[PDB]
Amino acid sequence: KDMEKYLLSSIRDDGSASFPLLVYTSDSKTFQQAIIDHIDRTGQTTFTFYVQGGVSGSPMSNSCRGLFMSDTPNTSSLHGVYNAIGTDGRNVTGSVVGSNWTSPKTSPSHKELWTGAQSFLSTGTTKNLSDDISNYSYVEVYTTHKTTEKTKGNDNTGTICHKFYLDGSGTYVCSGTFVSGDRTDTKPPITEFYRVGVSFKGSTWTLVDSAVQNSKTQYVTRIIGINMP
Amino acid sequence: KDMEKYLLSSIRDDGSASFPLLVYTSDSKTFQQAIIDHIDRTGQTTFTFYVQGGVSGSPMSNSCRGLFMSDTPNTSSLHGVYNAIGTDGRNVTGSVVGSNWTSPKTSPSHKELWTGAQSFLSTGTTKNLSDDISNYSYVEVYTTHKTTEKTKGNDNTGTICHKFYLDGSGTYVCSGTFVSGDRTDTKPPITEFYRVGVSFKGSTWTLVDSAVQNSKTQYVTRIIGINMP
């Protein structure tokens, strides 16, 4: 029992390890106050915690587990950081600086769901994702083009992102333009338009429709599943 | 103190806990050298640290705290990782493989600032954000559209992102194109442009202006605050 002021875990009377800070909604205390009370009682400076979901001022709304790090137990001018992980695996970080508490920074996360080269003309084609779309809140769709004319001898665009929120639409619409060519006296640079429409269902995606203003081949090439929790 | 070879925390002379590594700009040592010196002096392999802002080779420019992890105290071929948090709650991670140090990997972060459905025809209307816009260096504006003509039977677009660096413009301008209709039945694919202009003031945002090419309601539907520190 005499080492626990330095160590990440408490010791229960049966000798079992546990967290030294537990915070429950029944305690009627904010996450900030629970930390201050905990340092005042123990003199611990680096320690682990459980916060129950719905605790006010918690790093996140769900229950979370995390680590608080500090070097000096002065609650009248506290300086320190925490890193917390949710029950959904979200990551959040935050800090306290002269006892003032910073807004909790939530990290986004991603998985590559599909890659390849699906032509815009391949309408009615379905392909497998590496995961279910319901494990995401946002999607990036990527498209790779050739312009109608060449500018300084090149017609490639590089591979262009389209980011969407997953609102439950039956089509997600990638659409845009290019300017192409070199301006001569007789020939201005041309303008073109493009579209591709996609849909998602579980672990699958479908190329629904398109429009192309030249005879070259335009492709859908990457789908990334994004969480911004 | 017979445990201090393993503890995340040092034991100060009074018995108070602290970090076993404290790195200050007054030491005139790089973070990499401070880590090497600490491991050489103690044989610890997993330990906490503070790095003052302005220390050369630091995970970040600001003052930060973190955990270093390794399984073997061989400074002539160091293998390990670190996780660090700044005074702003940014997160930075990195690694040492065979005493070669990787580039530090700063996470971005985000917050949802507003959601709903504001019609593009509600110009001069102001709504609250969940936070002050000055906490963010970047913003994503989401808009949801119904196209002038149906594509295969559908006119919904999904919910489309528009990402801006917060350069202090009085109006951030979403503008772009939807290809609408299909080049089918006996009908041209009627291209439409659009614009909406929006602005931000502390914890509020205003729909400033709009330009729409058909008789269907178009909406602003989400605003996300982004940090890329």
Binding site: - | T115, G116, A117, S119, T186, K187
Partner: protein
């Protein structure tokens, strides 16, 4: 209509000409549309400008993508209009957006407070008596359970739930097989108000 570079030829055969091509696609070949559709769309536009009307208010609630099941109700003391989304009953942010967005077609004073539909669940332990010693099987059990669940789902959310109707639905099967059904959990006729909605739940058929 034709894409760029499709002609490639001339019929007059004069050998001076090297090649021919249309620089831009033709898109001016408009189709023929009768004035009926034009008149319909114009009338629809003219009717959508009405203000302070039941049908116009209902129409205006449809602009939000998540507002689908709008139901109109009228009361002088406190008028109310109910709406819900497919994902669930109602959220707080959507409800606030509905309140703020409906003001464009509400009458003066804005004496509205939209509340999300109060879903209720039904649980039934029905004992079903069958006078047939061969058709007796889990197929019939599953069919009756599916029928009851669908009938529960098929209610028009306005005082439609009664034990007699459930008995009549069960007895829609030929009386040669079905003999008797004895409800036990339904001890009264549940009559949800127009705010709430009654739907299916855990539903059992035990054979007798």
């Amino acid at each position: 209509n034709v894409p760029e570079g499709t002609i490639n030829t001339i019929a007059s055969g004069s050998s001076l000409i090297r090649s021919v091509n249309n620089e831009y696609s033709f898109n001016t070949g408009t189709k023929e549309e009768s004035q009926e559709d034009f008149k319909r769309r114009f009338h629809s536009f003219v009717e959508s400008r009405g203000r302070a009307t039941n049908k116009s208010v209902r129409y205006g609630a449809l602009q939000i993508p998540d507002v689908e099941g709008v139901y109109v109700y009228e009361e002088t003391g406190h008028i109310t209009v109910f709406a819900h989304d497919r994902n669930g009953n109602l959220s707080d942010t959507l409800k606030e957006d509905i309140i703020d967005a409906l003001q464009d077609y509400r009458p003066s004073g804005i004496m509205l407070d939209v509340t999300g539909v109060e879903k209720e669940e039904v649980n039934v332990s029905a004992t079903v008596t069958i006078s047939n010693k061969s058709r007796i099987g889990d197929t019939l059990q599953k069919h009756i359970e599916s029928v009851i669940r669908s009938y529960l789902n098929n209610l028009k959310t306005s005082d439609d739930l009664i034990i007699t109707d459930l008995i009549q639905a069960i007895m829609n099967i030929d009386d040669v097989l079905i003999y008797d059904v004895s409800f036990d959990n339904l001890d009264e006729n549940i009559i949800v108000p127009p705010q709430g909605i009654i739907r299916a739940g855990e539903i059992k058929v035990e054979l007798k």
